């Protein structure tokens, strides 16, 4: 335990920027792909919404991480908004 799960909705209409300011690493463990937050721009929108390095992305737009692919993801993050299910440590 120690980990908490919460939903995040981020919208591009808040910033002059067209990007959210974070990076993800993708890795396959025992046939299943997991997504982790690699870095978060301190001044970016993702940081503003509480995303942190080391967080795990469980879902994007209600789709499990292992069921996403790259073209699907590039599409979702170029849209005006996107929803995330994130597993994180408090603080």
């Amino acid at each position: 335990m120690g980990k908490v799960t919460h939903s995040i909705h981020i919208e591009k209409s808040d910033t002059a920027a067209d990007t959210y300011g974070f990076s993800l690493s993708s890795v396959e463990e025992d046939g299943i792909r997991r997504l982790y937050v690699n870095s978060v721009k301190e001044t970016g929108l993702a940081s503003k919404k509480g995303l942190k390095a080391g967080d795990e992305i469980l879902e994007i737009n209600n789709r499990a991480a292992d069921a996403l692919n790259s073209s699907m993801m590039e599409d979702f993050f170029s849209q005006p908004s996107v929803g995330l299910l994130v597993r994180t440590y408090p603080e």
Binding site: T19, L24, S25, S26, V27, E28, R33, N38, M73
Partner: peptide
Amino acid sequence: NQKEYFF
């Protein structure tokens, strides 16, 4: 199959 994405 370690990929990385920037968003």
